[PDB]
A paper describes a structure:
[name] (IDH) plays a critical role in the tricarboxylic acid (TCA) cycle and catalyzes the oxidative decarboxylation of isocitrate to generate CO2 and α-ketoglutarate (α-KG) with divalent metal ions (Mg2+ or Mn2+) while reducing NAD(P)+ to NAD(P)H. In accordance with the preference of coenzyme, IDHs are divided into two forms: NAD+-dependent IDH (EC 1.1.1.41, NAD-IDH) and NADP+-dependent IDH (EC 1.1.1.42, NADP-IDH). In the present study, we investigated the overexpression, purification, and detailed biochemical characteristics of a type II homodimeric NAD-IDH from [name] (PtIDH1). To our knowledge, PtIDH1 is the first eukaryotic homodimeric NAD-IDH structure proposed in the type II subfamily, and it exhibits a unique EF-hand domain at the C-terminal. Enzymatic characterization has revealed that recombinant PtIDH1 is a completely NAD+-dependent IDH and exhibits allosteric regulation by isocitrate, similar to eukaryotic mitochondrial NAD-IDHs from O. tauri, S. cerevisiae, Pisum sativum, and Solanum tuberosum.
The apo form crystal structure of PtIDH1 was determined at 2.8 Å resolution in space group P212121, and the asymmetric unit contained two monomers that form a dimer. Each subunit of PtIDH1 in the final refined structure missed several amino acid residues, including Met1-Val4 and Lys487-Val495 (15 residues). The monomer of PtIDH1 mainly consists of three distinct domains: a large domain, a small domain, and a clasp domain. In addition, a unique EF-hand domain is observed at the C-terminal domain of Gln424-Lys486, which is composed of a helix‒loop‒helix conformation. As with all structured homodimeric IDHs, there are two clefts on each side of the structure, which are formed by the large and small domains of one subunit and the small domain of the adjacent domain. The putative active sites are located in these two cleft regions. Additionally, PtIDH1 contained two insertions (Ala84-Gly91 and Ser323-Ala331) in the large domain, specifically forming two α-helices (α4 and α11) at the active site. Moreover, the dimeric interface area of PtIDH1 (4082 Å2) was larger than that of HcIDH (3638 Å2), and at least a 1700 Å2 interface area was provided by the EF-hand domain of PtIDH1 at the C-terminal. Therefore, the dimerization was formed through the unique C-terminal EF-hand domain in PtIDH1. The structure reveals that PtIDH1 EF-hand loop contains several residues (Asp459, Asn461, Asp463, Phe465, Asp467, and Glu470) that are aligned well with Ca2+-coordinating residues conserved in other EF-hand loops, indicating that PtIDH1 EF-hand loop binds to Ca2+ by canonical coordinating mechanism.
Residue numbers in the entry:
A (entry chain D), B (entry chain C): 5 to 486
Write the structure that this text describes.
């Protein structure tokens, strides 16, 4: 064994089907080739989080700032039923607040693609930057009765306390809501967003409700300033500002969610506030395929100012497939998002190892080894899917189980690492019918109803005319240029 | 000479094409049969609002409290350019805050229908209660720097000032936002909403994001408590809780916005917060022709306890047709929404007259006179549309001008009031192709792209399969139950 020593990396584990499948993937695709040992595991199981009163969470955050590259598994934010069943003494919420605080912010939700010949919802990649902090999700509130509410601001600027808002609550049933948006890291965000769009040949956009909530116009201002100063020239010089008329376009929240579903050939990126970005990314996810086919990557700033990158899949622990496994029924979990997050974490760990130790040879070379490996591992997994041996949500009921999918990808991976151009090339495909998706069984009787509805002619005479009627009746016909 | 005396009613006038067209409708359809004179006009033109520094709006509010029945025309909330041209020296905003304060609240957005046989988007009436007060639209905010923000609540319950939220703002560019919801009049709202859904055989629903925004859970509670206590029995007696499973259903606002577009059969009602209600009623408007086909009716409480009702169309002053009118080019403005508002205001004025003066004979029958009149007035307007002599956005290019339509409806109204059944009945119609809508021209080659290409299967040859997939790929196929 002369295996490569993987760079230091934080590894946060959860429970259930995703813990089982990540364990399977690391053992089959990584330990064959890597000395881990510099990985720093943390058990964020519900039970382990509760016994340590979340000291394992404070240790994961600490390890993350010091190391700066972290893969995290899906975790259970236990519901009351689940909190009782597990019997956790002192309920603890989502670890997200801890991580996003300890590491600074922004949350990249970009579509996953099988660049070797499986079409998905979007023909070309989509990027999305969901501002990691601020907004309604972090609001403080209280139900209050009669009186007056007073919002003061106390500057460290030495100046006098500021009356932000004062109001006279006449009712005996009120709710009051207060929150903030921190906007410093909007200019880092812009640089991350615009630059990654440059590299990818993506037309970028900014999405807000700034016309209606004027407190949001700061966001768009910084995005605009940074853009005009540093990237507009390079964007036109690549001819990407073309489908948006020469400048960075602002989209109001509610025209954004339409070009999402419309410009279905992809090749666009969007940046937005935390709440809006959550909603819009769920929407992009559904257009592309399912939630597991979207990235969920925190990018933040370490105290020293280096990049902290944390990677996640966009699904939970998948309890029902866990129960199927416990009762000996076969399961078929798509590991795509999980694998993508693991190789992102590993890649950034290698990058940080070289950046933290320049003037070290076998670290700028370890990085290049890592990137070549993750490239041929992607090939092994995409080709497996293309040979019809993907999991059952993509390859249909003849698709492999979780375990034989992992094993078959390891088989191709050991071969691909030694030339091995046997088999033959797998085929180009096309969207596996979305009905293969888990927990998506439609309503064939309803959709009968609606196609016969738009008839009034014969055996569904569409002949475009009905299509046009449909799309206007739908309120989805593209408007004109004007 | 013997015309009926209209009950007292406030009339708020605006500017431009709707002021001219309302003046014409009142002169042609009402003045023939009614002595107005007890109508109390207020000029809320931009110029008169700015010269009086909105004392005209404040007097209108006072008169509306005294009379309680108000028609208001669209008014201009002037844009900077428009404020320049008009030369208004102290900008004054929307009259909405004043009216909703002076009269209490909730904003009714219900679909308008041509009960004599022209189908539109929804087929059966849809009701919507948008909570008139509270929420994000009435927020205080500020740009703040480094420091600490402090939200105090000072009860008149005499107890100690309450720390709603305190937070430690580290950034140098922050925005802070605070707002409230008054929830007393939710139970008035419930009674208003549930009872009218009863009268109309509408299944009611409540829409919130209470699951993600816990402070909204009050809304669902009050609405539910009233329902279960005061209306559930009557709704099941009518078998209206059938498609919603026996009880009052709460919908998260993003499944609401799905059944909106889905249940195109109508026959449902929704109540929501001020902000969500704004967005969802814009969407209901779109499913059903255009925004001008949705009412906008304030309902509030006067000091005496009588209902205060203000009615508006859901469009503006229609500036572009005003430009055309001043240049002597003909215009064709659909007065449907404005008329629906005028006869609603007139009905409520008659109702208030009777309720405020019982032991008065010719007021309880003046009420019935008004209602008979408005019914034959609806028949005349609907029928004119069905004879193809409506305005051109409904009747295509052979439709009449604003002025010819008003004259033709006046002719039919005069004849109908004299038991004159000549002519011959107009036909049943069907949605006038929405391309006839003003300022709505489709990008037919884009929609080519989508039909000619996207659902291939040869030369057109769409039956199901591509329809079903189409609904799947856009994420608009109806799924499974829970």
């Amino acid at each position: 064994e002369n295996k490569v020593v993987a760079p230091p990396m934080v590894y946060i584990a959860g429970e259930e089907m995703t813990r089982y499948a990540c364990d399977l993937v690391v053992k089959s695709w990584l330990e064959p080739y890597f000395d881990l040992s510099q990985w720093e595991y943390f058990d964020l199981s519900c039970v382990n989080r509760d016994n340590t009163n979340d000291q394992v969470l404070r240790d994961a955050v600490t390890a993350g700032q010091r190391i700066g590259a972290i893969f995290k598994e899906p975790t259970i934010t236990p519901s009351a039923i689940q909190k009782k069943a597990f019997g956790l003494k002192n309920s603890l919420g989502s670890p997200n607040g801890a991580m996003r605080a300890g590491w600074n912010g922004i949350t990249i939700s970009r579509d996953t693609i099988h660049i070797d010949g499986i079409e998905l919802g979007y023909k070309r990649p989509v990027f999305f930057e969901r501002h990691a902090v601020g907004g309604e999700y972090g609001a403080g509130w209280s139900k209050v009765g009669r009186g007056t509410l007073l919002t003061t601001y106390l500057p460290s600027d030495g100046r006098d306390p500021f009356v932000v808002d004062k109001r006279d609550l006449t009712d005996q049933h009120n709710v009051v809501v207060t929150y903030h948006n921190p906007y410093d890291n909007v200019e880092p965000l812009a640089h991350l967003f615009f630059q990654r769009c440059l590299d990818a040949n993506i037309t970028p956009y900014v999405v807000t409700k700034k016309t209606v909530f004027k407190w949001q116009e700061g966001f768009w201002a910084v995005m605009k300033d940074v853009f005009d100063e540093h990237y507009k020239s390079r964007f036109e010089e690549k001819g990407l500002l073309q489908a948006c008329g020469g400048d960075l376009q602002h989209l109001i929240s509610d025209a954004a969610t339409m070009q999402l579903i419309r410009w279905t050939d992809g090749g666009f990126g969007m940046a937005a506030h935390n709440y809006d970005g959550d909603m819009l990314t769920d929407q992009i996810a559904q257009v592309h395929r399912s939630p597991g086919f979207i990235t969920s990557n925190l990018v933040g700033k370490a105290p020293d100012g280096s990049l902290i990158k944390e990677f996640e899949a966009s699904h939970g622990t998948v309890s029902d497939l866990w129960n199927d496994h416990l009762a000996g029924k076969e399961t078929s979990l798509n590991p795509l998002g999980l694998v993508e997050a693991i190789v992102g974490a590993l890649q950034h760990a290698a990058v940080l190892d070289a950046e933290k130790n320049p003037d070290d040879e076998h670290k700028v070379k370890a990085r290049d080894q890592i990137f070549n490996f993750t490239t041929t591992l992607r090939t092994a997994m995409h080709n497996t899917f293309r040979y019809g041996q993907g999991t059952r949500d993509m390859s249909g009921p003849s698709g492999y189980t979780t375990e034989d999918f992992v094993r078959k990808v390891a088989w191709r991976l050991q071969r691909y690492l030694d030339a091995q151009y046997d088999e033959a090339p797998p085929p180009q495909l096309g969207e596996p019918s979305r009905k293969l998706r888990r927990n998506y069984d439609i309503d064939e009787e309803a959709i009968n109803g609606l196609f016969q509805k738009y008839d009034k002619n014969g055996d569904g005479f569409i002949d475009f005319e009905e299509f046009t009627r449909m799309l206007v009746k739908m309120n989805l016909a593209p408007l004109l240029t004007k």
